[PDB]
Amino acid sequence: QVQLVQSGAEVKKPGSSVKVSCKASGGTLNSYEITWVRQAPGQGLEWMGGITPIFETTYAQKFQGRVTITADESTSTTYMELSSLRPEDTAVYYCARDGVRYCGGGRCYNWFDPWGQGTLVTVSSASTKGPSVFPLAPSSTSGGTAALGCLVKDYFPEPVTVSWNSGALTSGVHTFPAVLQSSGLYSLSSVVTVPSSSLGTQTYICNVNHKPSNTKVDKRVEPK
Amino acid sequence: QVQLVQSGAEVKKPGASVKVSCKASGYIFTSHGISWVRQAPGQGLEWMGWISVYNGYTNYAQNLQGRVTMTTDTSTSTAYMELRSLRSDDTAVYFCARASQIRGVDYWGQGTLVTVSSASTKGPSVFPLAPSTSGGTAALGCLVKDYFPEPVTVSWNSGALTSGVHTFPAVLQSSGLYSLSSVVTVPSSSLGTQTYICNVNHKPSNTKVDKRVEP
Amino acid sequence: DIQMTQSPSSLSASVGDRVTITCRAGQNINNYLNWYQQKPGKAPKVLIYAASNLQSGVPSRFSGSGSGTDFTLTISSLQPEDFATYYCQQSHSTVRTFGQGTKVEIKRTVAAPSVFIFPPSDEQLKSGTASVVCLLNNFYPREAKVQWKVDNALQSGNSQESVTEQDSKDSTYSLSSTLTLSKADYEKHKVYACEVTHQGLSSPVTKSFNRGE
Amino acid sequence: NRTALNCNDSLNTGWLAGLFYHHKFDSSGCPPRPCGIVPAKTVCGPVYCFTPSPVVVGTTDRAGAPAYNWGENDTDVFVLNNTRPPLGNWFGCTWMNSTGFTKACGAPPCEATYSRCGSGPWITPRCLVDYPYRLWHYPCTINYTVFKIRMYVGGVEHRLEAACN
Amino acid sequence: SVLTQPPSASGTPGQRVTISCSGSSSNIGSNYVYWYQQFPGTAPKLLIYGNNQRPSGVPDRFSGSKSGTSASLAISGLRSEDEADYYCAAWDDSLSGPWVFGGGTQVTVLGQPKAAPSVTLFPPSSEELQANKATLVCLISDFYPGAVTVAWKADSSPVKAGVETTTPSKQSNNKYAASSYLSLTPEQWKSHRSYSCQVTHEGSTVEKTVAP
Ligand SMILES: *[C@@H]1O[C@H](CO)[C@@H](O[C@@H]2O[C@H](CO)[C@@H](O[C@@H]3O[C@H](CO)[C@@H](O)[C@H](O[C@H]4O[C@H](CO)[C@@H](O)[C@H](O)[C@@H]4O)[C@@H]3O)[C@H](O)[C@H]2NC(C)=O)[C@H](O)[C@H]1NC(C)=O
Ligand SMILES: *[C@@H]1O[C@H](CO)[C@@H](O[C@@H]2O[C@H](CO)[C@@H](O[C@@H]3O[C@H](CO)[C@@H](O)[C@H](O)[C@@H]3O)[C@H](O)[C@H]2NC(C)=O)[C@H](O)[C@H]1NC(C)=O
Ligand SMILES: *[C@@H]1O[C@H](CO)[C@@H](O[C@@H]2O[C@H](CO)[C@@H](O)[C@H](O)[C@H]2NC(C)=O)[C@H](O)[C@H]1NC(C)=O
Ligand SMILES: *[C@@H]1O[C@H](CO)[C@@H](O)[C@H](O)[C@H]1NC(C)=O
């Protein structure tokens, strides 16, 4: 049972670089076959590179001259670094063991098991800025039902984590994907449906949490 | 089961390259090793060497002054024993046998008799050993002198006379040529209107001689 | 290079259907192909290795087959657990390449959305700018388009959308749509309204406001 | 070509990778049954037997004729029945099975010489017959330091190398 | 040879006869010792391996043991089916080996009575004297035990060369038979009174004589 845990999310500046670690544990070697894969927000998987246990790197042509995979066997962790950062590099970056694990009929096979928890690397010319959360105060909208959100606007980087009534209200909540504004700032909207017969009787707070810029903000949504 | 089928009995005179083969089956030929023991007739067994089917290791015996050459061919599961520069003493039944370190030499081939003597192949002269008795019976036979090599078939009456007969083991005279005799006892009265003839087959030479013994 | 191309790009099937994803290989990739399932907010998990071998754990509904260049992941009885994006991956080469994924989603009876306007807040209106957001809620299918009607005149490029993944409980989507101006351009015009058109809607559903009351 | 690669790392511990990249084993700390017929659909990697000197053995039809599959056919086996080899084939054998376990065989044990009681690669305690997959079959013997030795098996002079703690 | 065992043994129906094989430290001492059964005109059939270990076929009857530089087997219940030669062997770690055998021990059973030889002597046939040879053919048979000595005599005084005598063979009746040939010159054969074949068997003698 090999297991991989990865560096925390680094937030980097266009042109700069970033080095993600991937510590291995729980197996029988001091170095494994480690693979690096990135997945852009919403997009798909993009293989980048790999290191053999004898430290023989092979990279994807998409990033030759940009990406370097090294290894510190002593602490048995491997590193991946991608220089010349464009925003078009903002993605999640995983590692996995690409281990030879089954042979049969005189040929051997590799696959990706397990995968690290992933590291988000955000490349933008912004700077860490906390959000502003504004009530989407309800108007009452029939079916006996209403809707009341609150808008978390202008923050960087992702991610933000919102809840309602501290996890007590969860049914029919819809929190939306953050959109990247041309401000370079992200903004999303969490909305909840609710029996309109409760507007004015049930208090509704939305608890927004941006750990990048350690900001806990609870904002009550009364109607208007 | 496991057996060992040795080749036939070769025969040749002194200074000769015998090479008896020994075909193995019923086990993993390469697993064990095999040896050779000869037995000159009457006396005891003489260990003569052994070989690895696998290593090629060979411990030949001191007595046989580097004459021996045990040899195997893992392809055909056959094992061989060449012995050069032959001499009289080398007349023996030559067995092969599987050999384990724990079970000894344990299963033996049937036998390969191989004979050396200055003699050439020569059919037998047959002479009637005519009847010269008093038990209401009589002894009569015929002598199969000076032939080489063994063996010699002998019937009477082309196989009609079965009871009363007795064909003796042979004798090696100093000449190197063998001779034996076969007698058949017969009822004294019947030496008329009932004849007695001995048929002698010496297959090595292709000599059939059928001789009749009268009084 | 060595190019994996999947088809279809995406797919919608009813629980218990038979789904058939195709990976084609640029080159004869011999037998070296893998299948990964990823669902959202998780890393991928292997599913089939060497074209046809199910990872321990993986239910028997999943079947890999093929060699050479034309491979096929199939699900015999699409169970609800099974809605995710499936990638393939090649392995004849040491430069690994991934398929593009095919996202499988759940066919579902058509659903009328429910439109809502939320007027900008006063709290937002003592500092800076002003954004107004239309909300389509719990509709199926996802395909729907929305436009903004300032004074019945139309806006272009002032707005950005976002949709939720298909909803876990009722297998629907929901749509946000934030249109953006400043106190300048907002406390200036008079009425507007997102106007939504959806297949579940006989004809568009407008919902409006007025800057006062 | 006649080596049987039926390997299977279903626990993802990493052994099967060591077969290909040696010396990367992680220490962190750390009798034999009679030889016979082993299904090659079970063995992973070179099979070795010890005379005590080591030698790789190949696949085979149970008839004995060598079979050149990669352990693929179940008509494909390693025939290993042994006899103690001044005369025989080898003292014992050792290999890895499909799920990554080191397996061994040999003649039966028992003045306690290797020539009389040796059942594989073990010789004396601590000294072990060195061979290009020792670190893979006996990995904990990675600290073992490897001397040049010579032994006699009923007279035959043998040169070999022994790893010892 | 290298090992030693008694040349014979005797027995009665079911009398557990014994037999011994004796060597040195270099053989019986540290090594195993095996025992073989040899029926005349057949390869040896291994009877006991290790020291007390018997293989297939071998009855519960045949068993053995070893003590010091002595290994000895007991044949236990006797059926004459056991009447054979019996050879021992061990390894020999030294140069005296690595493998050594015994001289064997032919083993007979005491049951059968004493029989006396019935002898026949043939003179030279007319057909042989024609070929300038002479052969006296003396046929000893039906005797037991197979232990007999033959002596040729001319004119009642000894003859000792040109004589050829066979080893006793256990003929059908499980008694014995042997032949003795004297080779003469026709001149010798005629130039004597008579020739005599004297064959003795357990202290007693029978003679048969011929003349030209
Ligand atoms: C073969 O020789 C090598 C020579 O280096 C030797 O390798 C050493 O093994 C020790 C023992 O595992 C290693 O020490 C470790 O160090 C780490 C820090 O890197 C510690 O955290 C480890 O402690 C944990 O594990 C112990 C169990 O082994 C637990 O008891 C303990 O409570 C901890 O949980 C551990 O002590 C050392 O790092 C390596 N090499 C060096 C010097 O770097 C190997 O052990 C030898 N093989 C044999 C014959 O054992
Ligand atoms: C490779 O070698 C290992 C070790 O010998 C083998 O593992 C052993 O496998 C057997 C049978 O699969 C196990 O016994 C079984 O245990 C289960 C309980 O989980 C029980 O349900 C069965 O009835 C049976 O008793 C055994 O415990 C296991 N031992 C170890 C130490 O792992 C393995 O099978 C070999 N693989 C091959 C393909 O040769
Ligand atoms: C490779 O090994 C795995 C594991 O040993 C095999 O999968 C097992 O198959 C048995 C068959 O009865 C199942 O009972 C187990 O649940 C499976 N175990 C695990 C842990 O996966 C697999 O068959 C082997 N490879 C092939 C294709 O033969
Ligand atoms: C090898 O050993 C196995 C296990 O007893 C046995 O079945 C097989 O017959 C053996 N082969 C030989 C020739 O001993």
Secondary structure element (H or E) that encloses residue C63, with its range? strand C62-67
Strands C19-25 and D92-97: unpaired
The answer to whether C146 and C136 have CB atoms below 8 angstroms apart is: yes
Chains A and D form CB pairs within 8 A to the count of 79
- Does the beta carbon of D37 sit less than 6 angstroms from any atom of ligand 4? yes
Structure token pair of residue C100: 């593009």
Structure token pair of residue D50: 């010890």
Pocket of ligand 3 (CB under 6 A): A 102; C 53, 56; D 8, 10, 99
| Chain E residues touching residue D86 (CB < 8 angstroms) | 98
Q: Are residues A121 and A131 in the same domain?
A: no
- Mutational pocket test of ligand 2: of D6, D41, D96, D101, the residue with most ligand atoms within 8 Å of the beta carbon: D101
| Closest by CA position to D24, among listed D35, D15, D36 | D15
Please say whether the dihedral angle defined by the alpha carbons of residues C164, C169, C170 and C171, taken in this order, is positive or negative. Answer: positive
Q: How far apart are CA B121 and CA D165, in angstroms?
A: 71
Q: Where are the beta strands (DSSP E) in B77-215?
A: 78-83, 92-100, 104-108, 113-114, 125-129, 138-147, 153-156, 165-167, 171-172, 178-186, 197-202, 207-212
Q: How far apart are CA A119 and CA A131, in angstroms?
A: 22
Chains E and B touch (3+ CB pairs under 8 A): yes
Mark out chain B residues that contact chain E at CB-CB < 8 A: 35, 37, 42, 44-47, 50, 59, 62, 95, 97, 102-111, 125, 127-130, 132, 139, 141, 143, 145, 166, 168-174, 179-181, 183
Q: Are residues A88 and A147 in the same domain?
A: no
Q: Are residues A105 and A134 in the same domain?
A: no
Q: How far apart are CA D108 and CA C72, in angstroms?
A: 53
The answer to whether E112 and E174 have CB atoms below 8 angstroms apart is: yes
CATH architecture of C1-107: Sandwich (2.60)
Structure token pair of residue C49: 């290795």
Q: Rg of the Cα trace of chain D? A: 16
The one-letter code for the residue type at B97 is A
Q: Domain C108-211: which CATH class?
A: mainly beta
Q: Are residues B202 and B100 in the same domain?
A: no
Query: What's chain B's length in residues?
Result: 215
| Chain B residues touching residue D107 (CB < 8 angstroms) | 102
Q: Are residues B38 and B79 in the same domain?
A: yes
The answer to whether D25 and A122 have CB atoms below 8 angstroms apart is: no
Q: Are residues B107 and B183 in the same domain?
A: no
Q: How far apart are CA D34 and CA D103, in angstroms?
A: 11
Structure token pair of residue E27: 């053989």
Cα separations (Å) of B52 from A78, A112, B100, D83? 54, 51, 10, 11
Strands A67-72 and A77-82: antiparallel
Question: Do residue D155 and residue E98 have CB atoms under 8 angstroms apart?
Answer: yes
The answer to whether A207 and A162 have CB atoms below 8 angstroms apart is: yes
DSSP for D93-159 reads EEEEETTS-EEEEES------HHHH--SS--SSS-EE--TTHHHHSGGGGS-EEEEEEEEETTEEEE
Distant-in-sequence, close-in-space partners of A79: CB < 8 Å, separation ≥ 6: A19, A20, A21, A22, A69, A70, A71, A72
Give the end-to-end CA distance of chain B in Å, rounded to a whole number: 56
Cα maximum dimension of chain C: 71
Q: Are residues A95 and A12 in the same domain?
A: yes
Q: Are residues A66 and A132 in the same domain?
A: no
The domain total for chain B is 2
The one-letter code for the residue type at A43 is Q
User: To 5 degrees, how large is the angle CA A143–CA C167–CA A141?
Assistant: 20
The answer to whether C183 and C120 have CB atoms below 8 angstroms apart is: no
CA B204 to chain centre: 12
Strands C102-106 and C10-13: parallel
Q: How far apart are CA C147 and CA C169, in angstroms?
A: 29
Q: How far apart are CA A22 and CA A49, in angstroms?
A: 13
| Closest by CA position to C65, among listed C21, C16, C99, C26 | C21
Question: Do residue B102 and residue E49 have CB atoms under 8 angstroms apart?
Answer: yes
Question: Do residue E30 and residue D155 have CB atoms under 8 angstroms apart?
Answer: no
- Does the beta carbon of D81 sit less than 6 angstroms from any atom of ligand 4? yes
Class of residue A145 by CB neighbours under 10 A (exposed 0-12, middle 13-18, buried 19+): middle
Query: What's chain E's length in residues?
Result: 212
Strands B178-186 and B171-172: antiparallel
Strand partners, B180: B144
The residue among A109, A125, A141 that closes a domain is: A125
Strand partners, A4: A24
The residue among B93, B118, B143 that closes a domain is: B118
Question: Do residue D154 and residue E98 have CB atoms under 8 angstroms apart?
Answer: yes
The answer to whether E73 and E20 have CB atoms below 8 angstroms apart is: no
Q: Are residues A145 and A83 in the same domain?
A: no
Distant-in-sequence, close-in-space partners of A112: CB < 8 Å, separation ≥ 6: A35, A37, A96, A97, A98, C34, C36, C44, C46, C89
- Mutational pocket test of ligand 4: of B28, B102, B106, the residue with most ligand atoms within 8 Å of the beta carbon: B28
The rounded Å distance from CA D27 to ligand 1 centre is: 7
Q: Any idea which residue has 């025989």 for tokens?
A: D88
| Chain E residues touching residue B102 (CB < 8 angstroms) | 32, 49-50
Q: Are residues A16 and A114 in the same domain?
A: yes
The domain total for chain D is 1
Nearest to B31 among D83, D155, D156 (CB): D83
Structure token pair of residue A32: 């494994």
Candidates C92, C118, C132, C166, partner chain A, best to mutate (most A CBs within 10 A): C118
State the DSSP code for C165: P
Host domain of residue A197: 126-224
Cα separations (Å) of E34 from B172, C98, E82? 35, 71, 18
Q: Hey, whose CA ends up nearest to atom 20 of ligand 1?
A: D28
Phi and psi at E152, nearest 5°, equal -95, 145
- Does the beta carbon of D88 sit less than 6 angstroms from any atom of ligand 4? no
Q: Are residues B112 and B140 in the same domain?
A: no
User: How many CB atoms are located within 10 Å of the residue C203 CB?
Assistant: 5
Atom of ligand 1 nearest to the CA of D30: 50
Report the gap between the CA of E100 and the closest CA in chain D (Å).
Answer: 15
The residue among B84, B101, B118 that closes a domain is: B118
State the DSSP code for A62: G
User: To 5 degrees, how large is the angle CA B87–CA B89–CA B93?
Assistant: 110
Resolution (A): 3.1
Q: Where are the alpha helices (DSSP H) in D91-163?
A: 114-117, 134-137
Q: Hey, whose CA ends up nearest to atom 16 of ligand 1?
A: D28
Nearest to B31 among D82, D86, D156 (CB): D82
Q: Any idea which residue has 């209403």 for tokens?
A: A146
User: How many CB atoms are located within 10 Å of the residue A198 CB?
Assistant: 15
Question: Do residue B169 and residue E169 have CB atoms under 8 angstroms apart?
Answer: yes
Nearest to B173 among E38, E139, E164 (CB): E164
Phi and psi at E106, nearest 5°, equal -70, 135
D11–chain A Cβ distance below 8 A for any pair: yes
Report the gap between the CA of C95 and the closest CA in chain A (Å).
Answer: 6
Host domain of residue D40: 1-165
State the DSSP code for D134: H
Q: Are residues B114 and B140 in the same domain?
A: no
**Spans of all domains in chain C:** 1-107, 108-211
Hey, what domains does chain E have and what are their CATH numbers?
1-111 (2.60.40.10), 112-212 (2.60.40.10)
State the DSSP code for E128: H
- Does the beta carbon of D68 sit less than 6 angstroms from any atom of ligand 2? no
Count of H-run helices and E-run strands, chain B:
0, 18
